Design a protein around this ligand. Sequence first.
Ligand SMILES: CCCCCCCCCCCCO[C@@H]1O[C@H](CO)[C@@H](O[C@H]2O[C@H](CO)[C@@H](O)[C@H](O)[C@H]2O)[C@H](O)[C@H]1O
Ligand SMILES: CCCCCCCCCCCCO[C@@H]1O[C@H](CO)[C@@H](O[C@H]2O[C@H](CO)[C@@H](O)[C@H](O)[C@H]2O)[C@H](O)[C@H]1O
Ligand SMILES: CCCCCCCCCCCCO[C@@H]1O[C@H](CO)[C@@H](O[C@H]2O[C@H](CO)[C@@H](O)[C@H](O)[C@H]2O)[C@H](O)[C@H]1O
Lengths: 606, 103, 171, 459, 126, 170
Amino acid sequence: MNMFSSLSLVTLLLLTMPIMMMSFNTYKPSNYPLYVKTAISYAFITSMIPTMMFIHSGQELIISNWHWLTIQTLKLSLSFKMDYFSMMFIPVALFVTWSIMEFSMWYMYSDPNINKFFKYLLLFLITMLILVTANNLFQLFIGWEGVGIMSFLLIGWWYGRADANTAALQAILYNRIGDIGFILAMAWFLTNLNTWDLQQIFMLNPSDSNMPLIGLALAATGKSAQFGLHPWLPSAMEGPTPVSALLHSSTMVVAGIFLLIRFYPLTENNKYIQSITLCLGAITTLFTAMCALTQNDIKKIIAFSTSSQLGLMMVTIGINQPYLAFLHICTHAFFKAMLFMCSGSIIHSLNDEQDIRKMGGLFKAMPFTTTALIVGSLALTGMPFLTGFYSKDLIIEAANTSYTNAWALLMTLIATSFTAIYSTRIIFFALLGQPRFPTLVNINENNPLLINSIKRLLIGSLFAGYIISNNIPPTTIPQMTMPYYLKTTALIVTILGFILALEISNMTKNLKYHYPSNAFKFSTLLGYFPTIMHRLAPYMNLSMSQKSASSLLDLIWLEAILPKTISLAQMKASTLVTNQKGLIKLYFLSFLITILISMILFNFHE
Amino acid sequence: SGYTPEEKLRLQQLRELRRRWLKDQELSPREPVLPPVIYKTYRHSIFAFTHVLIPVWIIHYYLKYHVTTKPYTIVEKKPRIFPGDTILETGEVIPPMKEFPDQ
Amino acid sequence: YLTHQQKVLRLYKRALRHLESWCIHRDKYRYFACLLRARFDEHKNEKDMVKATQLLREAEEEFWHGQHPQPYIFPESPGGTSYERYECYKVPEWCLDDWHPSEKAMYPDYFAKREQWKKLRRESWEREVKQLQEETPVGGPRTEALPPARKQGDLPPLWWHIVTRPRERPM
Amino acid sequence: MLKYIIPTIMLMPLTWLSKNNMIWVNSTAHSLLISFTSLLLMNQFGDNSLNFSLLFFSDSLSTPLLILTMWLLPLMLMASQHHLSKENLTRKKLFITMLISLQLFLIMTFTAMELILFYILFEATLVPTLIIITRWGNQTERLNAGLYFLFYTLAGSLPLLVALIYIQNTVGSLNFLMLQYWVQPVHNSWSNVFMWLACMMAFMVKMPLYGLHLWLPKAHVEAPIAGSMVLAAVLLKLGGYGMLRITLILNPMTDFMAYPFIMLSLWGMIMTSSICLRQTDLKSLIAYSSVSHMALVIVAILIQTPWSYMGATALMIAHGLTSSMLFCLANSNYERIHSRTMILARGLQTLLPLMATWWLLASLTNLALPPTINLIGELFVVMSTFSWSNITIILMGVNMVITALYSLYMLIMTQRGKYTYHINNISPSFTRENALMSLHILPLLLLTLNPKIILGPLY
Amino acid sequence: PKYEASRLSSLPTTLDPAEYDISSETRKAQAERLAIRSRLKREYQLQYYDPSRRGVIEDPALVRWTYARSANIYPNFRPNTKTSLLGALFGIGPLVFWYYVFKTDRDRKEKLIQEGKLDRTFNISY
Amino acid sequence: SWDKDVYPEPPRRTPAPSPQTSLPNPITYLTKAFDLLVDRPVTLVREFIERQHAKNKYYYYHREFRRVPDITECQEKDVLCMFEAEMQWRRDYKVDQEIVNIIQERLKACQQREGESHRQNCAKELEQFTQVVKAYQDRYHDLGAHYSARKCLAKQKQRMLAERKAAKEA
Ligand SMILES: CCCCCCCCCCCCO[C@@H]1O[C@H](CO)[C@@H](O[C@H]2O[C@H](CO)[C@@H](O)[C@H](O)[C@H]2O)[C@H](O)[C@H]1O
Ligand SMILES: CCCCCCCCCCCCO[C@@H]1O[C@H](CO)[C@@H](O[C@H]2O[C@H](CO)[C@@H](O)[C@H](O)[C@H]2O)[C@H](O)[C@H]1O
Ligand SMILES: CCCCCCCCCCCCO[C@@H]1O[C@H](CO)[C@@H](O[C@H]2O[C@H](CO)[C@@H](O)[C@H](O)[C@H]2O)[C@H](O)[C@H]1O
């Protein structure tokens, strides 16, 4: 226990040291990025020790080390949950971040604020680890909002660009809408269970859990970009490519799913909540995969790939398979981060070109990025025995054989076919055919930082799923008896997706000119959701602010009904009193009227 | 629809000045005038000492002598016990399961 | 402010770029680029300008129907993925005037040459103002165009913020 | 409290007897020393308040407000000494004297045991505040702002005077310790409805309650920086502190009398938050942000629960430092471009990198990022209003979204984008300005490590 | 299929039928617009390029805009059937609406508590 | 270090190592390295510090509050008696908050300790938590921010009157 708890905390403290060194104590600015990258790699080693101890004997513990605050009967302590979910996620996050940080040392080499960039990446990682190891809701909320704010600063990295500032604020807007659900759950859990600690919530185990769980579902919707609060994630491509790699794999986006996984003891008894998450995930995975089919920006295709894969995780929550949802988070982190890294390699070689229509003919020019891109695409599409197969295929079988919404099941299978199509689209247009890029050839992927960082994620993208699946302890009874057509559905629809994708891709070479359909326009413009919602809602809110709240009310009627009218009455009254003619005759005449009135009317003489 | 002769003359004059300005951005040789495997292991040796060993000493001292001296601050899940296990604390032997029906 | 010729040539360039976005492949784009050029060539010598305007109007309606919903954009063009990316690195030259003397001391040669440019700007300014006065009609300028310098030793009026603007890749 | 009243008084002979060129150095140094000694008021007990004498007492509510008040005086001297540089010596000393006299009234106001004594000092703060705005404000409209400020206060405070004297006739005392034991329930009647309104409206106008807030954006746009700092940081809290005390003797009538003012606050905060999205003047935007934050405090005070009272106290302290920071940040731009228009100077992060960090930190506290005390206070209020009625979470949640939008909008518009080409006088941040910003944020963020000291008596 | 403009999607300039039917009277107006723009451009550039200037080039258009968006409203405000109905509809109406929402919710909750049908088993924080 | 009766713990049952593999256990060697590299040096420093402490032994005490008459024995408006009764009530109220915290802490530790068997093995802790929360709720819930012994007594009498009324009609 002493080694387990000591080493788990040292991992987190190790990550904070490069941040503390920004106080210019013992700093070597020459190579701060190397220093930060070295800290991550050493933290990965230290985190494998408690992870190994958990795998051996299932050792789990909670560290409530610092009493922060007691509010009457609610005691808040800095508490860390070193359990199954935190033991397996932390090494994966650190391993992936290690590659991303090493890659960023090449990708961001010419950025004058590279030191600040690596500090923000490190702060990003710290707030995620706070999120993942939190044992109470207030601590979790610190990490919850921390990753959101770090997303804002990294999406808007190139702050002179209006589109970057717009995308950064859009992430804040959508995530804060999800945060309404988060505070709802906190309020419900305090009022009804008198706690924010996971232990007491699970022990009391409320049966009337609709309200808190809908709040958590809303929080996950925003954070994991499920349908309704989804547009911000593809918009986050404004950030530098290393931001997207980290944002889409080991940090921001999986937090929503992780929040629902942490509360599976409640959701597993709530079929109403299961139905909602099942259908929310199904429409998300289908809709965003459909959007990816026609995107031309490489970073946007992969961004929509993440939204589709997140929706699948949300479907896995819906069918009450939280540990399968968690496994997909871990496997997805490897090949999704690689795919962004490979795309960054292509973008860099083509002088910041991100349109696949201007790529082509790179299969031999960039052999290593090609290999990684092909491996990553095969892992994403569930090629057997690669890292993605050990989660997705189990998820599809579990969904196929579950008691579940039939429509949600069909939408999920179609989205699996669409995954093959849009992965084929990247490979076909980026790597095959003839070059379509400019004439001055500057292709070069021979930097050891680029090669080594992608290499490590390539190895993970092959073996990580096999290694993880063979070491985690069983917590369910996996369904292994089913008809042949329910066992192979994932493989078949994926293969049909590849074949159909090849027909579409090759037809673009025929000397025939085609007009666009409504389906094509609907896919390209993302179902018009950003176009309608991002114009209408801001217009309505911003118009209400100036026209009615500010001018109509605060500069007019609240002025009129009091200070403006009161002043008029006094000014009019003053002119009545003072506009006298100065005549002795008129004043003494009023004296007579006063004396008479005093008696006849008021009887002051009595 | 090309430059007028006056447009051409102005562009030529600004072009001469702009190129002169850009050349004047080059640093002279002395600028900036500044005011006054064995290695690889050692680099990684000093880092491990200062960023792993020293922090773990502090954390272990803090956990052992301050946190674990208070109730319920570190709570372990109790170890799983299986049929046929022996207990260290007592020496108790957990009996085996029944004989399985053949399968 | 656009002539008929300018409108036609803008549509030709715009239509070809959306065609290239649909075709993608260079050999396919070359084929349809020639077909489109032929369509502009058949009505090249139209003289009845009423007919020419109707042809332009109908062509624009055709372009709107057939435009790519997601056309290619050069990375640094407005709406591109690198547009305004380096604006955060562009610092105006007047900021060097506020440098501490020790900061200026690190670049003695750069700041000596900078003083020469400031001297050149100072000694040129009065003549620049006078040239604009004597060349501007009574009611002020009617266009945004500016003239060249006329004599030798003169500089074109209002040159400083063009000549000394930040570099496109300033860091 | 004499150990704080007398050294505060001694600041005035110090300023008037200083060397001509040492008035800022001397007044700043010694008011920091007074601020240091104010930490002795932390001797608070779990059951009893710190009852010094027949005139003055301190408890967990007044203590944090006292420390904020005495901390702000040196910060106000730092912020003012630049725009007052041309002012002649005698008028500089008169300005400092008004700030000192404001602090003296404030520390007596927050520790007065008797409610009528609290009233007189509560009213006395108007005089120096009005003088600071009208005499040293910059624009023509400071005279109107002075009048609106003066008459909004007196329109409410005069009825409070009648109510307070009436209570003393009926109860025999206005000593707050006495009222804790002799309080009797307020029965339903039309006389008691107007007694309730007389007891509350003066504090509502100061908070300010939505609908009685129109004087505050005026006051800020016209006040000098020190006026804005003290107005936002402390003077608004006179209403909250007053409400927290007087609600003792208004039960159970507050059960139903609070409804109209909860509706005004709950809807008011969304309106004022929405208004911030369209404000064109930076000072006016910060002013409307205060109305929205203080609408939370009114709700918290009116629903009277331990969690809401703890949240109200933390919010009052947290907002005091944050809003004072934001005004100081906006003023530092004003001292360069001499305009409050938010859209005038853009992309300032390119020209003032470190000042943009202070802008970021201030904005993050304004939107209540956890675990800042800004968030702790807001969260505690949201928790308690949820029990009051579950539907309030929708209004509370919407305001949180709008608050983030306008806080980051202010940061984005002024610090990011492209710099304005013709504004070529953005000189580097002075040491004074950087120190002023850090003397706000650093105590604010340090309080996160020991929040209990700003949570009030209900802790 | 004709273009249908909306408030949030303007008619493209190339599809505007007034874009092509350009008269000598319309060219005269375009010339006068460019003269105002050019006159203002010159006035700006003479200050912008002046080597001796340090500060802000005050823009009366910006000052007029900020003045109009605040101080100029109430003087030009008239109480009439429009502003009174908008003043009432969005000024008092929401307060009455929310009053009934919260008042009804709290009466229902209080009636259940008194009858002992609201579950407050572990509710000891408020 | 703490009273085991107040913060109880079951006797810990650890299984003995029972390897079924020829591979060495990496955890066994890391445990030895950790004990040698981390624990022993840490223990030496602590023992030096404990020796210094033993040279300067001094004591502090837990304050004892004598009982005084409660608000029920105070004449109306007699502030001197009310004050002492009120302060005592406030001290008891703070103590009752911490008693609930102790029971909640017991409940939370049981839940973690018993793992997947917690729903069955933590019944006694859950029952104790339910009872103290009920008792605490009766005393203090609904009193408002301006609570007092007077308001607490009024609430109790309202509850007593309801209990008597029901008992009569039975
Ligand atoms: C709740 C009770 C509060 C009681 C407070 C009593 C406050 C009394 C304030 C002084 C009243 C008279 O104050 C005086 O009013 C008039 C009318 O508004 C103002 O007059 C001004 O506004 C009017 C209205 O358009 C203009 O026509 C006029 O040209 C202009 O000068 C005077 O400039 C002001 O000096
Ligand atoms: C018995 C009842 C009367 C009690 C009187 C008790 C105090 C008597 C003080 C007498 C000396 C006053 O001193 C007189 O005022 C001030 C302060 O010193 C001095 O002048 C001052 O100018 C400026 C401030 O304005 C400062 O540089 C400095 O404070 C001082 O030089 C005069 O040069 C001196 O002549
Ligand atoms: C409900 C509790 C609080 C109620 C407080 C209400 C009392 C009155 C407060 C304001 C008193 C100011 O007194 C007077 O008001 C008017 C406007 O109102 C000001 O006048 C101002 O508004 C008027 C009307 O639009 C304009 O004509 C005038 O040009 C402008 O200066 C006077 O310059 C000021 O002297």
